[PDB]
RNA sequence: CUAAGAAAUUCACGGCGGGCUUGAUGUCCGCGUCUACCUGAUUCACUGCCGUAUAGGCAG
């Protein structure tokens, strides 16, 4: 998303008392829900935004610059795969590379 | 029906100033290389003659 707003990305990714925000305004915590909001709409509305961040916004669309590649099915068949790009993989595995090129076990 | 499908890197350029690498040196003792074979298979497609002949025959 924007460049300049991901100060609340740091704000909900945030261990007070143990863990993260996420599975506290998932669930029904009255330890959560009530510190941000003195009325309970507010609560409810300030829950449902953050909560929906992690869902998909929007209906399904992979745009025509990205990849859409035909695999044949079994039988008779064919589905349209667009792959979408594992950021997520990727940090783990350069994680893992930059400690074993640069980590300092590694180099010792 | 292929991480599918698409694409101009490019213009210009002084690398050179100079220099002692030299001194000395024991390679070395010893040694059983044997045994047994068909080169030759049409392996000399050769020399001469009749005929203008490359066409085609003939002589030892």
Redesign the pocket.
């Given at each position: 998303g924007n460049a300049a707003a991901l100060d609340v990305f740091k704000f909900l990714s945030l261990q007070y008392q143990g863990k993260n925000l996420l599975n506290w305004l998932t669930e029904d915590s009255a330890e959560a829900l009530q510190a941000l909001s003195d009325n309970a709409e507010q609560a409810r509305e300030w829950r449902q935004a953050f909560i929906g961040i992690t869902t998909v916004k929007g209906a399904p669309a992979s745009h025509?610059?990205?990849?859409?590649?035909?695999?044949?099915l079994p039988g008779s068949g064919?589905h349209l795969l667009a792959?979408?790009?594992?950021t997520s993989l990727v940090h783990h595995v350069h994680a893992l590379l930059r400690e074993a090129r640069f980590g300092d076990a590694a180099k010792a």
């Amino acid at each position: 998303g924007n460049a300049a707003a991901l100060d609340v990305f740091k704000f909900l990714s945030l261990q007070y008392q143990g863990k993260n925000l996420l599975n506290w305004l998932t669930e029904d915590s009255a330890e959560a829900l009530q510190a941000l909001s003195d009325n309970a709409e507010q609560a409810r509305e300030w829950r449902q935004a953050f909560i929906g961040i992690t869902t998909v916004k929007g209906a399904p669309a992979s745009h025509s610059l990205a990849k859409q590649l035909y695999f044949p099915l079994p039988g008779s068949g064919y589905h349209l795969l667009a792959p979408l790009f594992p950021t997520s993989l990727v940090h783990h595995v350069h994680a893992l590379l930059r400690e074993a090129r640069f980590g300092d076990a590694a180099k010792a």
